[PDB]
Design a protein around this nucleic acid. Structure first.
Ligand SMILES: [Zn+2]
Lengths: 55, 69, 65, 24, 91, 212
RNA sequence: GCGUUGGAUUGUUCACCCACUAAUAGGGAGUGAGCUGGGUUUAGACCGUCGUGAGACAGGUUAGUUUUACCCUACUGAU
RNA sequence: CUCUUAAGGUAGCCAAAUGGAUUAACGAGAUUCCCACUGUCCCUAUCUA
RNA sequence: AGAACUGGUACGGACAAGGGGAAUCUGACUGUCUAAUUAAAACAUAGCAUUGCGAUGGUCAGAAAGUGAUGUUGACGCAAU
RNA sequence: GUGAACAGCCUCUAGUUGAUAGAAUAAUGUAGAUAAGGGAAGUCGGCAAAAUAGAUCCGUAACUUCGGGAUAAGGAUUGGC
RNA sequence: AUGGUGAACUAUGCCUGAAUAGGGUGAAGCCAGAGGAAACUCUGGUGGAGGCUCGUAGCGGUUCUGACGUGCAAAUCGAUC
């Protein structure tokens, strides 16, 4: 999923496309956020701090 | 028999002359120093009799009072 | 005394252990023995790297290693 | 310690690194 | 239509037994269930015979074969070798 | 201690083979003057699968030289045999597939199966499906015939020993994985109670030395 | 003389936090056959250590039947 | 008897689709969390055999 | 299946009958055992691989046999792993 | 008959009225339920209850060995003439 | 230690008989339509195999601060699986 800004639309579109939602009918933003943080912790989404520049 | 007997192994190794120093339970494995090391795990129990009484104190538990000087 | 009977394992029968109940100068290069070979124990809280030696001369007292 | 080339290692083929997926 | 993608006849096995064993079994299963021409007719009516037998639905003939084929290639090679040795001994 | 499971196999109580479904003991025709100095024709009336065996057992028929009666025999079904074939059996028989011939008469390198280990045993070697011996040589003096056994070890044998031509039918049966325990149970039901084979590490020390 | 609170944390809890309240002070009989988790945890098993092996052990996890009184007395009611 | 250290900018050289064990399904196995839910509780009360 | 009408607090009207979802450790599974405390990461499982054996043989049983199981067997087999 | 069904209930032929009972409905118990507002704040721990349950239609994601997940999830309806 | 007794319960091999409602998913095989010179790539049909699944009888007893545990029972009962 893409096109998000401020990450609120990110969580909403992700909960909609993933099929996760609270009954009638709001998306479960908290549960999708849990999977987002779990993917960030497990390394499923690549990321790394920039190494310091060489002398 | 016959070569598996511990006396036969002591003759083949030349250890039969060691005399009384041999530890109890010595065999082809666990040289006597190894037996003295393994025995420490069970050495903490104190001996006792029918009375009962401490016929011998537990290791490092003699209870005797040294005369420090 | 001077040797607490530490007990270990699910069944505390042999207990295979002793521990000092008093202060000890373990030394700078202690490097704790592995626990499987550890019979005697000298817990770090009882250890001291310094002593309050006092010099009878001049009446002075100083903490020294 | 001797020389140790880092090129023998193969980085994990994470889904976000593959070019097969794209949007827009 | 081709409802299956690649599981073929082995899709009855389902998710169990994995993919590699499923393919190794699918190959021999397609080899076994396939019809074969009878040498005494040439009609495509031969059917499997409990691992080795291969009865012709017509002509009621029976012929020995492989566990999953009417004739393993090694058997055809041994037969050609026996034929060569026989034609050589005859001369 | 206690008796190990392998030691109980000799008692025979439950380890005996379930022979009821077997069609019979496969065997070559008993040696006779006809094969010693000629050959006897014999139709293969039918082939049928044998329980507890990896290849079909052929049912050849033969007339009795000494009496007016047919004499059926359960030959192993060599690959490429067909019903109604005239399975010649004798020292003079041609090297057609499925015929039984003495190993000495065959040209060197000839393929054969169910060859006798010694004369009169009615077939001992390569009885399993897909196996065949090779006649790698000949020693006409002190008649003997070197042969390559399916295991690959060489072995000498008397030239008089008989052996059907061609590989045994049903080879390649092991190529297919069984894919499940139930086929293994259905296969071992005809053979013996050797399966399931419990691991020795899981046995109690009284049961196996490996246990404990 | 009367009050001295509702809970989170077990990659543990001989502990501390927020919030209210005037305040959330310290102790004995505790209630180990009133009930309960950690635990006195025997019979199953696995991971790591020792030991040639049998087995436990510097450890940890998992699942595991101790079942009042109608007897006497005390107390609350009732002739 | 000498003697051990370079790797650059968001995905790379690549080995004859993939570089997987961080494995899908399955489980009266154990564990963490979310929606509904309700007397577990605030605070207990009532009816039936 | 479709089109009007109609009583509803109701409409699989009692009966009947999954709660669902996001993850971790463990074992692939179907399956089986401690009858009477432990049903499990335990046992078993097809798959993977080693060893000995070509019959005067390999694993064995039997006081012994002109004895017996594998063997109505033969290396694509047997027996221990 | 109802019902997808030898799922649950009533009835037909047929077989039974057998389980010690009479009088009230105390406390405390076993079994089946209801409850204003919060909805796990109780408990080591969602221990037990409850909640969706059948059917028609829309729709169903990550992963994956492509076979499965799946009745995923989330939604509209069910009566009678 | 000596001599005898047991597989009617329970462990296993074998022989011979008996028992296993109703639904969901849809494999080979085959039929028709649309593309490509062909393999073949799809669409619409029949098919009912899965050591499939939900769910009766049957099998076993995972779970209850459940009943009783001087019990109906020296292992049962209700729910649940
Ligand atoms: Zn034909």
């Amino acid at each position: 999923i893409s096109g998000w800004k401020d990450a609120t639309e990110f969580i909403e579109i992700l909960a909609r496309k993933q099929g996760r939602l609270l009954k009638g009918g709001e998306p479960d933003e908290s549960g999708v956020s849990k999977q987002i943080l779990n993917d960030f912790n497990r390394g499923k989404i690549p990321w790394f701090v920039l190494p310091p520049e060489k002398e | 028999g016959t070569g598996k007997k511990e006396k036969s192994r002591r003759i083949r190794e030349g250890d039969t002359k060691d005399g009384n120093l041999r530890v109890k339970g010595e065999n082809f494995y666990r040289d006597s120093k190894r037996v003295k090391f393994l025995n420490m795990y069970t050495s903490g129990k104190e001996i006792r009799n029918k009375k009962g009484n401490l016929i011998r104190a537990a290791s490092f538990q003699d209870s005797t009072i040294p005369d420090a000087r | 005394e001077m040797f607490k009977v530490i007990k270990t394992g699910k069944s505390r029968s042999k207990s295979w252990k002793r521990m000092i109940t008093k202060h000890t100068f373990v030394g700078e290069g202690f490097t704790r023995r592995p626990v499987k070979m550890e019979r005697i124990i000298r817990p770090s809280a009882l250890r001291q790297k310094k002593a309050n030696v006092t010099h009878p001369e001049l009446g002075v007292t100083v903490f020294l290693p | 310690m001797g020389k140790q080339d880092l090129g023998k290692l193969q980085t994990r083929k994470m889904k976000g690194l593959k070019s097969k997926f794209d949007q827009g | 239509a081709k409802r299956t993608k690649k599981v073929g006849i082995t899709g009855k096995y389902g998710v169990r037994y994995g993919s590699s064993l499923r393919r190794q079994v699918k190959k021999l299963e397609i080899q076994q269930h396939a019809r074969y021409d009878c040498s005494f007719c040439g009609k495509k009516t031969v059917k499997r015979g409990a691992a080795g037998i291969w009865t012709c639905s017509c002509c009621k003939k029976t012929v020995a074969g492989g566990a999953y084929t009417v004739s393993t290639a090694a058997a055809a090679t041994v037969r050609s070798t026996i034929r060569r040795l026989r034609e050589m001994v005859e001369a | 201690g206690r008796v190990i499971r392998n030691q109980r196999k000799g008692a025979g109580s439950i380890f005996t083979s379930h022979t009821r479904l077997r069609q019979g003991a496969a065997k070559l025709r008993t040696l006779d003057y006809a094969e010693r100095h000629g050959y006897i024709r014999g139709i293969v009336k039918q082939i049928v699968h044998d329980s507890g065996r990896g290849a079909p057992l052929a049912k050849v028929v033969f007339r009795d030289p000494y009496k007016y009666r047919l004499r059926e025999e359960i030959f192993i079904a060599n690959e490429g045999v067909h019903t109604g074939q005239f399975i010649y059996a004798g020292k003079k028989a041609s090297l057609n597939v499925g015929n039984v011939l003495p190993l000495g008469s065959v040209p060197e390198g000839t393929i054969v199966s169910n060859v006798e280990e010694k004369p009169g045993d009615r077939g001992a070697l390569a009885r399993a499906s897909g196996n065949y011996v090779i006649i790698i040589g000949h020693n006409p003096d002190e008649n003997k015939t070197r042969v390559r056994l399916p295991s690959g070890a060489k072995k000498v044998i008397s030239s008089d020993a008989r052996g059907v031509i061609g590989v045994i039918a049903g080879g390649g049966r092991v190529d297919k994985p069984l894919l499940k325990a139930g086929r293994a149970f259905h296969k071992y039901r005809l053979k013996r109670n050797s399966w399931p084979k419990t691991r020795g590490v899981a046995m109690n020390p009284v049961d196996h030395p490996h246990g404990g």
